[PDB]
């Protein structure tokens, strides 16, 4: 949405989490890593967990449907 | 064509060319890391470039002075 | 003023500010084209006089 | 047509003001409109036309009050 | 539309402006204090001010 | 043909056709006018700023269009100075009397009014025409140079204009023998600078692949001559044609020095690869020559023509002054100069830019037209949109004097005379309307020769600006325009006769 | 260094160009009526309703247009008229010129 | 090999051909340069500028550019 | 009326009316066809004002 690099930042955050930096995230100002605690980018645990669980549940629901049958259209 | 940011490179190279006059300070298209174009062994004939500029100017001037085209526009079926 | 500021705001945003000034500069051009007399002249003497 | 309504109510205004001359004012107005439309198709911006018409009217009334 | 009569109408119009406002303490001018009738026909030279 | 009935509707159709035919050339008047490019079949679109040149390539089909083009062609043939002016002037006459034909104005009334207005205009121009021929014409030619300078005033070639004007008027003063476009033929050459351009008193052509094969010609020969040969010169019955070929090849070598010819002319290719066979001749050869070259050489001293297989005449190496063949810009050029009556002038268009061909066409040719009209004519007036203002003012003043039908028609005529400054200043690009009012005030009160300046786009007293126009040529142009307008107005209906 | 982001997707950009084109159509239809030297607008209603004036926002209320950008330009003009009461015609012209600048 | 319809495109085609048989390389340069020249020429025309002065300024600019090209020349064997 | 202004001695040529009986130019002050000054002045003023108002109206397209 800002035209920044994708793969380089993915690898950078992968390495940062490899050292254990669970606070290393992207910054739109510079496109680099930073401390979200210091940088102020913080998110609610409950909201994020609900988002993840709901996405997984909806995906599971959708994948369980195989055949769709259509009756006579009214138009 | 490549993908780098155009205008920041434009301004930086212009500032450096102000610092030192050189026809070898330009875009590093091959991402060699240096703007020293001569170091990258790129040579083109000066006659080609002057002819390019002159031809482009003459053609643009000619097109600027022409405002007549005839069309029937009947929209045949 | 915005033009000279964009000259001193060298960067990616400098030409954005320059175009802002150029686009905003249309109202005197509208008034001048209502008067027939060259709006480009009108505004270039306006520029010179305001500079002086 | 709205332009016709404007012209006819100017005519009624003139008639209520002085009486005679409604035909003359309507005819002169129409002639001025068509001549000015030709002259604006001659690439003249209409405000100059309006200013010239006002100056001409002033000079005409001053001439009439003099001759 | 009132171009030539703008100079003419400015004094009377401004004087009517202070009639509906307090020129000393009223920080806001009510646009609803003045009402206009769209009298079919007429001439700008026949400007008429009414206080009632 | 829509509403092409007998009477006024067909006249309206003719006037509309005249307006349309004017629109095509309406924008090319003047030296700084735009050019026209229109498809003409196989895509050979031609660039030509001259309005008459546009006229020769139009697609006129309406009878009014044809009967205006013929008048334009006649005017062009009579003089080359001013053809857009007459057509556009006639179109203005027609379109400004069009708001009168429909009221019931019988066309004969318009014809009478046009003729009397033309007579008044001719009298007015005659009584104001100023003669400046005696003002140092034969001697002190600086006035001619100043007049020629107008052709390149305030342009990128103004620095080189002085020398070019001086030497072209020098060439003309000994060539004041009714010159024309073909008589003075220039040639374009690349390389070098534009300052050292010259005008030889002869011709100039390049030895192309089909022009000359032999080199190191005897340049320092004082008896040149053209030999026109209508035959080729280049290199179980097969043996028969072989023998015929050998005999012809041997026979074609007997017209080199046995006949005594230094320059041979032929319409068949001359082989440069066969130079070793052309080297034995030791004589210049010219092939695929243009008809312009042929006529200029014939008028210069007169070359011989051979018709038979071994035709020989006494003018094979007759009287011509000297031969010249000098390489220019690294390439050998042929100069058939050095003749007793070499009444030709070829300009060496020295210049790096190849595309300046049209620019030099519109500069040097206009300058030499200016000097030729200044020399040939004697009485000129300051125009460029000034003299037309004088005529319009006088006619409009005279209109109020006379009572009768023709008063309004003469008024419309005078109103139509103002179009020349309009078009000139519009082609310049300035605000046309302001120029008109400024000219009218400064002309009615100020002076009788205030005209437009194309350089700074403002008025100027054109008498000081030296914007001269020959009085006689202007009179003829106005007469032709009035005659064309009268001829169109006096017409009611066409006759079709499609098949039977 | 070298290349950054490929920027593969482009259609919403040209859609925004279309929006700017509509905004300029409205803007230069509005532009003329500014100043004493100026001349009234040039806009006819599709339904046929007619008004005749020199104040811009009245014309802004004339149009029954489709593109939301034009509608929100009308909102901008009426908001400016509510706030101060002058220069409303200028605001629309400035907005259109800025939109063309954004295009460039 | 383009399906050229308007004569201006054909004129650009002969421009490209002239550059190609004159030099061989840089044929892309003339087309893009003319494109950008017209890019700002059309806004200059929208401002209400007649083409004559635009053409004269463009020719002056071309002379300036050619002078710069001559100034920054460098040749080898 | 051209002689009324060009010729300064022809001052008393300014009332050539239209004798509708024959449709011939004729002295009209002697004839006596008269129009009040206020009538013509107001007529011209109102015609000019109407022309200005109409010419000042172009805010449609049709
Ligand atoms: N006896 C007359 N001869 C010539 N013209 C006349 C005569 N009487 C009136 N007129 C003309 O009639 C005109 C005004 O008539 P008109 O305006 O039609 O009257 P109304 O306004 O009542 O219709 C005047 O301009 C005047 O010149
Ligand atoms: N420098 C100049 N200043 C003013 N008028 C000029 C100038 N040069 C040419 N003209 C005008 O251009 C007219 C004719 O030009 P043009 O139509 O281009 O060629 P042609 O003479 O073949 O018709 C002349 O009547 C002349 O008055
Ligand atoms: N007498 C005048 N001389 C010069 N400019 C004027 C004059 N009157 C108004 N203007 C200009 O007209 C512009 C717009 O004013 P106006 O049209 O009244 O507001 P709106 O555009 O909201 O209707 C102002 O910027 C002002 O500078």
CB F350, CB F196: distance < 8 Å: yes
> CB neighbours of F133 closer than 8 A, spacing ≥ 6?
F377, F378, F379
Q: If 0-12 CB within 10 Å is exposed, 13-18 middle and 19+ buried, where does residue F320 land?
A: buried
Q: HEC profile for chain A?
A: CCCCCCHHHHHHHHHHHHCCCCCEEECCCCCCEEEHHHHCCCCCHHHHHHHHHHHHHHHHHHHCCCCCCCCCCCC
The 3-state DSSP class for residue I17 equals: strand
Q: Residues of G with CB below 8 A from D47's CB?
A: 36-39
Residues paired with I19 in a beta bridge: I24
Cβ of F456 under 8 Å from any chain C Cβ?
no
Pick out the residues of the known binding site of G.
35, 86-90
Q: Residue H41 corresponds to which tokens in the numbers above?
A: 């020429």
Q: For residues C34 and G54, is the Cβ–Cβ distance under 8 A?
A: no
Distance in angstroms (rounded) separating the CA atoms of residues F79 and F86: 12
Three-class DSSP labels, chain F: CCCCCCCHHHHHHHHHHHHHHHHHHCCCCCCCCCEECCCCCCCCCCCECCHHHHHCCCCCCCHHHHHHHHHHHHHHHHCCCCCHHHHHHHHHHHHHHHHHHCCCCCHHHHHHHHHHHHHHHHHHHHHHCEECCCCCCCCCCHHHHHHHHHHHCCCCCHHHHHHHHHHHHHHHHCCCCCCCCCCCCCEECCECCCCCCEEECCCCEECCCCCCCCCCCCCCCCCCCEEEECCCCCCCCHHHHHHHHHHHHHHHHHHCCCCCCCEEEECCCCCCCCHHHHCCCCCEEEECCCHHHHHHHHHHCCCEEECCCCCCCCCCCCCCCCCECCEECCEEEEECCCCCCCCCCEEEECECCHHHHHHHHHHHHHHHHHHHHHHHCCEEEECCCCHHHHHHHHHHHHHHHCCCCHHHHHHHHHHHCCHHHHHHHHHHCCCHHHHHHHHHHHHHHHCCCEEEECCCCEEEEHHHHCCEEEHHHHHHHHHHHHHHHHHHHCCCCCCCCCCC
Q: How far is CA F281 from the centre of its chain?
A: 42
User: Ligand 1 centroid vs F250 CA: distance in angstroms?
Assistant: 107
F434 neighbors F39 (Cβ within 8 angstroms): no
For residue F37 the two structure tokens come to: 């490019």
Report yes or no: F334 and F206 within 8 Å, Cβ to Cβ. yes
Cα R_g (chain I), whole angstroms: 18
The protein residue with its alpha carbon nearest to ligand 1, atom 10, reads I33
Nearest CA in chain E to D13: E42
On the 0-12 / 13-18 / 19+ scale of CB atoms within 10 A, B22 is middle
CB neighbourhood size of G90 (10 A): 20
Helices F471-489 & F107-128 angle (0-180, nearest 10)? 180
- What is the phi/psi pair of residue I14, to 5°? -145, 10
What is the rounded distance in angstroms from the CA atom of residue F483 to the CA atom of residue F475?
A: 12
Shortest Cα distance, chain I CAs vs residue F400, angstroms: 6
Structure tokens at E8: 């003419």
Record the tokens describing residue F231, joined without a space: 């035959």
User: Which of F35, F66, F31, F39 is closest to F53 using CA atoms?
Assistant: F35
Which regions of chain C does DSSP assign to beta strands (E)?
A: none
Record the resolution, in angstroms: 3.7
Are I17 and D19 spatial neighbours (Cβ–Cβ below 8 Å)?
no
* CA gap H20, H27 in Å, rounded: 6
Angle between helices G68-83 and G11-30 in degrees, nearest 10 = 50
Instruction: Suggest the residue from D32, D33, D59 to mutate for an interface test with chain I (most I CBs closer than 10 A).
Output: D32
At I19 the three-state DSSP class reads strand
- φ/ψ region of F226 (left if φ > 0, alpha if ψ in -120 to 50, else beta) reads beta
| Atom number, ligand 1, closest to the C-alpha of residue I18 | 4
Chains that touch C (3 or more CB pairs under 8 A): B, D, F, G, H
Question: Would you call F50 a catalytic residue per the annotation?
Answer: yes
Way it was determined: cryo-EM
CB of F265 closer than 8 Å to CB of F224: no
Collect all residues with Cβ–Cβ distance below 8 Å to F489 and sequence separation of at least 6. Answer: F11, F94, F97, F101, F107, F110, F111, F114
Question: F45: closest CA among H41, H32, B63, B57?
Answer: B63
Rg, chain G, Cα only: 17
Of B43, B51, B53, which is closest to H23 when you measure between CB atoms? Answer: B51
> Cα–Cα distance between D11 and F350 in angstroms, integer?
74
Choose which residue among G86, G92, G94, G95 to substitute to test ligand 3 binding: the one with the highest number of ligand atoms within 8 A of its C-beta.
G86
What contacts C27, CB < 8 A, 6 or more positions away?
A: G34, G90, G93, G94
Minimum distance, in Å, between the CA of residue F223 and any CA atom of chain B: 44
8 Å CB contact of B11 and C15: no
Cα-to-centroid distance, C20 and ligand 3 (Å): 22
Angle (nearest 5°) at CA F407 between F400 and I48: 70
In terms of C-beta density within 10 A (0-12 exposed, 13-18 middle, 19 or more buried), how is residue F280 classed? exposed
Distances (CA, A) of F296 to C33, E22, F175, F182, F320: 57, 97, 14, 9, 13
Spell out the residues 6+ positions from residue F320 whose beta carbon is closer than 8 angstroms to its own: F223, F224, F225, F300, F301, F338, F339, F340
How crowded is the C-beta side of F335, counted as CA atoms within 13 Å?
29
CB F367 within 8 A of CB F168: yes
Residue F84 annotated in active site: yes
Strand F284-287 to strand F450-453: parallel, antiparallel, or no bridges (unpaired)? unpaired
**Angle CA B20–B25–B29, to nearest 5:** 165
Is F401 labeled as catalytic in the residue annotation? no
> Which residue from I minimizes the CA distance to G54?
I59
Q: What is the distance between the alpha carbons of residues G6 and H37, in angstroms, rounded to a whole number?
A: 28
Ligand 1 within 6 A of D23 CB? yes
* Beta bridge partner(s), residue B66: F35
Centre of ligand 3 to C-alpha G89, Å, is 9
F429 vs chain B: nearest CA distance in angstroms?
12
Which residues have C-beta within 8 Å of that of residue G55, sequence separation ≥ 6?
G33, G88, G89
Round to whole Å and give the CA distance between B13 and B27: 8
Alpha-carbon gap, residue F440 to F433, rounded angstroms: 11
CA dist F494 and F62 (Å) reads 10
- Beta-strand ranges (E) seen in H1-77 are none
**Can you tell me which atom of ligand 3 is nearest the CA of G54?**
23
SS3 G82: helix
* Residue E15 backbone class (left: φ over 0; alpha: ψ -120 to 50; beta: rest): alpha
**CB of F266 closer than 8 Å to CB of F229:** yes
Q: What is the C-alpha to C-alpha distance for residues F488 and A72, in angstroms, rounded to an integer? A: 76
Q: What tokens does B40 get?
A: 């990258």
Torsion of CA F108, F114, F115, F116, to 10 degrees: 110
For residues F152 and F455, give the distance between their C-alpha atoms in angstroms, rounded to a whole number: 10
Measured CA to CA, the distance from residue A45 to residue A43 in angstroms comes to 6
Pick the residue from chain G with its C-alpha nearest to E3: G36
Nearest to G55 by CA among G85, G95, G25, G27: G85
To the nearest 10 degrees (0 to 180), the angle between helices F142-149 and F357-376 is 140
The answer to whether the annotation marks D21 as part of a ligand binding site is: yes
- Rounded CA separation F145/F162 (Å): 7
């Amino acid at each position: 949405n800002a035209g920044y690099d994708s793969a380089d930042l993915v690898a950078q955050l992968r390495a940062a989490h490899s050292e254990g930096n669970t606070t290393a995230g992207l910054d739109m100002r510079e496109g680099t890593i930073g401390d979200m605690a210091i940088l102020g980018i913080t998110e609610s645990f409950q909201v994020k967990r609900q988002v993840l669980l709901s996405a997984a549940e909806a995906a599971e629901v959708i994948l369980r449907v195989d055949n769709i049958i259509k009756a006579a259209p009214r138009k | 064509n490549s993908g780098m940011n155009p205008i920041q490179t434009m301004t930086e190279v212009r500032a450096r060319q102000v610092k030192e006059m050189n026809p070898a300070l330009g875009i590093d298209c091959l991402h060699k890391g240096t703007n020293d174009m001569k170091q990258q062994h790129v040579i083109e004939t000066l006659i080609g470039k002057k002819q390019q500029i002159s031809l482009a100017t003459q053609m643009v001037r000619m097109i600027l002075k022409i405002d007549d085209i005839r069309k029937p526009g009947e929209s045949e079926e | 003023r915005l033009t000279e500021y964009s000259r001193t705001l060298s960067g990616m945003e400098s030409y954005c500010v320059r175009a802002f000034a150029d686009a905003m500069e249309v109202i005197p051009s509208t008034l001048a084209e209502n008067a027939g007399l060259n709006p480009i002249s009108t505004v270039t003497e306006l520029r010179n006089r305001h500079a002086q | 047509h709205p332009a016709a309504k404007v012209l006819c109510e100017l005519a009624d205004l003139q008639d209520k003001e002085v009486g005679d001359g409604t035909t003359s004012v309507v005819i002169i107005a129409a002639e001025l409109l068509k001549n000015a439309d030709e002259l604006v198709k001659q690439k003249i911006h209409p405000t100059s036309v309006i200013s010239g018409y006002r100056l001409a009217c002033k000079e005409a009334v001053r001439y009439i009050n003099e001759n | 539309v009132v171009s030539q009569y703008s100079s003419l109408l400015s004094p009377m119009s401004v004087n009517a402006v202070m009639k509906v406002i307090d020129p000393a303490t009223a920080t806001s001018v009510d646009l609803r204090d003045i009402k206009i009738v769209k009298k079919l026909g007429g001439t700008i030279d026949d400007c008429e001010l009414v206080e009632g | 043909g829509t509403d092409s009935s007998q009477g006024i509707p067909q006249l309206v159709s003719n006037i509309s056709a005249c307006q349309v035919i004017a629109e095509a050339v309406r924008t090319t008047l003047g030296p700084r006018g735009m050019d026209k490019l229109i498809v003409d079949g196989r895509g050979k679109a031609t660039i030509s700023n001259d309005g008459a040149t546009i006229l020769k390539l139009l697609d006129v089909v309406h009878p009014a269009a044809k009967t205006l083009v013929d008048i334009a062609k006649s005017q062009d043939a009579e003089v080359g100075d001013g053809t857009t002016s007459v057509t556009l002037l006639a179109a203005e006459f027609l379109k400004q009397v069009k708001p009168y034909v429909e009221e019931g104005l019988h066309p004969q009334i318009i014809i009478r009014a046009f003729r009397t207005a033309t007579q008044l205009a001719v009298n007015k121009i005659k009584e104001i025409a100023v003669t400046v021929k005696k003002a140092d014409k034969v001697e002190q030619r600086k006035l001619l140079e100043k007049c020629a300078m107008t052709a390149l005033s305030s342009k990128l070639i103004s620095q080189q204009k002085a020398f070019f004007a001086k030497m072209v008027v020098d060439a003309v003063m000994m060539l004041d023998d009714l010159l024309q476009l073909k008589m003075i033929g220039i040639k374009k050459v690349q390389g070098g600078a534009l300052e050292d351009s010259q005008l030889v008193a002869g011709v100039a052509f390049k030895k192309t692949f089909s022009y000359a094969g032999f080199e190191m010609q005897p340049k320092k020969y004082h008896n040149p001559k053209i030999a026109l040969l209508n035959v080729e010169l280049e290199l179980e019955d097969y043996q028969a044609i072989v023998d015929a070929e050998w005999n012809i090849l041997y026979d074609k070598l007997e017209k080199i020095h046995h006949s005594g010819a230094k320059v041979v002319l032929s319409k068949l290719p001359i082989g440069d690869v066969a130079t070793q066979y052309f080297a034995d001749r030791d004589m210049f050869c010219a092939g695929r020559v243009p008809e312009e070259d042929l006529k200029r050489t014939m008028m210069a001293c007169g070359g011989s023509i051979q018709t038979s297989v071994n035709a020989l005449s006494a003018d094979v190496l007759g009287r011509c002054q000297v031969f010249e063949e000098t390489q220019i810009g690294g390439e050998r050029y042929n100069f058939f100069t050095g003749c007793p009556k070499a009444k030709t002038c070829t300009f060496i268009l020295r210049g790096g830019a190849e595309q300046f061909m049209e620019e030099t066409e519109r500069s040097l040719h206009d300058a030499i037209m200016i000097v030729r009209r200044a020399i040939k004519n004697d009485s000129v007036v300051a125009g460029g949109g000034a003299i037309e203002m004088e005529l319009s003012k006088y006619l409009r003043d005279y209109s109020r004097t006379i009572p009768g039908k023709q008063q309004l028609l003469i008024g419309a005529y005078a109103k139509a005379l103002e179009i020349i400054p309009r078009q000139l200043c519009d082609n310049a690009g300035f605000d046309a309307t302001n120029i008109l009012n400024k000219l009218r005030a400064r002309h009615a009160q100020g002076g009788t020769w205030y005209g437009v300046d194309i350089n700074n786009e403002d008025i100027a007293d054109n008498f000081e600006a030296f914007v001269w126009e020959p009085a006689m040529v202007r009179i003829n142009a106005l007469t032709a325009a009035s005659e064309a307008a009268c001829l169109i107005v006096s017409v009611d209906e066409t006759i079709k006769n499609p098949r039977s | 260094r070298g290349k950054g982001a490929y920027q593969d997707r482009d259609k919403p950009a040209q859609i925004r160009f279309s929006n700017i084109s509509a905004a300029k159509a409205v803007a230069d239809a509005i532009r003329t009526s500014l100043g004493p030297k100026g001349m009234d607008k040039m806009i006819q209603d599709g339904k046929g309703d007619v008004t005749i004036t020199n104040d811009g926002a009245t014309i802004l209320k004339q149009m029954q247009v489709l593109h939301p950008a034009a509608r929100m330009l009308v909102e901008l003009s009426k908001a400016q008229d509510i706030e101060a009461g002058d220069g409303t015609t200028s605001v629309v012209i400035i907005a259109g010129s800025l939109l063309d600048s954004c295009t460039k | 090999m383009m399906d050229v319809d308007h004569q201006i495109a054909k004129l650009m085609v002969e421009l490209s051909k002239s550059q190609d048989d004159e030099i061989g390389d840089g044929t892309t340069g003339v087309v893009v340069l003319a494109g950008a020249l017209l890019e700002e020429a059309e806004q200059l025309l929208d401002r209400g500028i007649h083409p004559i002065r635009i053409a004269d300024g463009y020719e002056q600019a071309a002379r300036v550019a050619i002078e710069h090209l001559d100034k920054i020349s460098d040749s080898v064997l | 009326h051209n002689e009324a202004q060009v010729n300064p001695e022809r001052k008393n040529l300014k009332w050539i009316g239209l004798d509708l009986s024959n449709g011939k130019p004729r002295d009209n002050k002697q004839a006596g066809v008269f129009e009040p000054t206020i009538v013509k002045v107001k007529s011209l003023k109102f015609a000019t004002e109407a022309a200005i108002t109409i010419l000042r109206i172009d805010d449609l397209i049709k």
